[PDB]
Symmetry: D3
Subunit: 151 residues, 6 copies
């Protein structure tokens, strides 16, 4: 249960707006642990693979062109219910409908530039991790704070 | 749409409690842009003009005496849906009923000292701006971050 | 009304995770005032006295063993509606169900390690204060900011 | 003594990089009080009568174009020794040589884009304040925290 | 070595200006541990046996009245070299002369209201701690983060 | 000139003490750009070819065991004078001797656990970067804020 993992990615707008430290702190200070991270520029190809679910939607091409229009911070966070909470933390899809206190609510204005992405379910989480990370890049260790975060 | 503007004012209590930087950061870090700002001490007269809508209410006189009991930070923020979000950011009228994460919720205790004011609609927004700022004091420029905030 | 007081305690997990300054700031920056504080390690005995209400529940013993498994920051905050708001600030009992922006929501993961405790009612508040503090340790003064927090 | 005022301006690069809240906080939290503030886009000319003591240098022109390439947050801060501490807060002219903890040392990288400006003396202060603010724009009030700051 | 303790107190002006969280954070985040804390309003007399080494000076009386003009957050911090670093954290006696990054350099303006106090040596520490805390008020535990701090 | 890169790594004690966000912010907010980052648990051996210039010292072994006792956040930052300022940001090798405002002065206590590492020169940088990152792992893009930083 405390081994659940989710995929979080700071999209290009987030990175180009210098929200890395800020976004990372919301997950770090919560008690979740960073078991994988990397910077990279998705190829339009790769982008389409990540969005394979939306391949036949109007905005599909835009999403792919955008997700590959700049650097991206890919991450994998471990923790109990981290997938669900990662979303609670991220906020509504549209910033204008997210409550202050959530990442999108505090740091973004409109849907098209909603700075971050988080897995929306246990399965997509696994797929998304499998797609952005080679198992060698992932880590396994016990945080010192674990005794007090879960006990 | 991305040109909408709202009026935000840090009332005397807010200023006397040193919440300027803090309040400003909630709007700045969101992605909205400061197109007008000034410090000043409203005259009871001016105050009544701003609250003209409440001229025949019990508390009217209190509001006017208070809004002129010290310095005030008047501002105009530009951004898509900034008027509505400016309110979401500000929180409920009564601090005790605002959720943590909102300005009033985090930084104020009771209704009578709810530290800030934001326009509550597209029309009052225009009137309020027209009343606190001479067009010369307002600015127009494109933020560097615009490409990534709206795209 | 502005004299209401509540009991807030940073449990061992909170202290062992270095959340003192952070937790304290949420109450301080709100406008409430610290009228009593101390550090100490509850004895399993004392713990049972504090949890006397849950003496015949499965988890009772766990709670007592835990509340005495390390240092604790006991506090008493004064302010209008501070009891109720202290809870709003703390968030749901289970971190996973607390909204970002609340202490538990931002800084904790699961129910068993929900880092803090706040009185849940005007009566328990009085009892809890009476139990953790000798009247000599409590203070009475008027904050300079009072004129602007309540007026 | 505690009525000393200095002029602080956030340069276009500062504003453009959204450092308004951050900068203002360094001053507000110290105890100084904001007695004058406005946002404006300096005219190429205006820029020149600000950097006038440098009209002799080979960068005066470069400076003037930049100080008008975008919005500027002009400010007036009051407090004892504010002019001098204002500079300590800002740090060395060259970010590379500023100490971590100072505005430029933390938020800027090179001299050409040192995001902020602060009067360097009692005189330049007096002038600078008069050059950027009409006396009405400034306010006079005693902060609630004055009794505990001084 | 890592059991060294120092006495830190937030003066009335500090408390009155709501700097409790801010100050405590500078210490907590460094790695030192809070082993003793209380809030109290020093009696005019109590103030005098604290500033006793200064009963000779012409401000001893002024000091004593002030240290009792309001609430005070008294604290005891433990950690290696805490006494010395505690002072570095606090900064110069005179805020005007403290470096940005230090508690006084960031949150205070003048000497008369330098918001905080920290033991200046191993001895004054020992005494100061005994003068403000009963041995029960202090705690002894090994922080979870000890293994990674030392 | 503005393509200078340095290697920054958050040591196990740093990661274990949840200072990832804090450290990264000191760099991000300055204007430097994250062009390479990964998390990994160095092998006892790997640790040795990093601290190789110290294989002569009586702590080389101690160092190597530690740099592999837990996860590590390895990073590559780009910006003008980044190598040098990166060090100013980090502060003295010994936390006790670092100034408040620096990463070690604020978040660490002793030399043995100084939570972070930063290349000390242009050469060691070049090597260190090549030792920890495959050229694919690094990225090349011009940040939106480049026009206002330089």
């Amino acid at each position: 249960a405390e081994l659940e993992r989710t995929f979080i990615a700071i999209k290009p707008d987030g990175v180009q707006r210098g929200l890395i430290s800020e976004i990372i702190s919301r997950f770090e200070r919560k008690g979740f642990k960073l078991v994988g991270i990397k910077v990279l520029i998705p190829t339009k190809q790769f982008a389409q693979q990540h969005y394979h679910d939306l391949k036949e939607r109007p905005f599909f091409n835009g999403l792919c062109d955008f997700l590959s229009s700049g650097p991206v911070i890919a991450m994998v966070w471990e923790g109990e219910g981290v997938i669900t909470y990662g979303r609670k933390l991220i906020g509504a899809t549209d910033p204008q409908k997210s409550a202050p206190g959530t990442i999108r609510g505090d740091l973004a204005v409109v849907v098209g530039r909603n700075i971050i992405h988080g897995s929306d379910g246990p399965e997509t989480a696994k797929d998304e991790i499998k797609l952005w990370f080679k198992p060698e890049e992932l880590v396994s260790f016990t945080s010192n704070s674990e005794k007090w975060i879960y006990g």
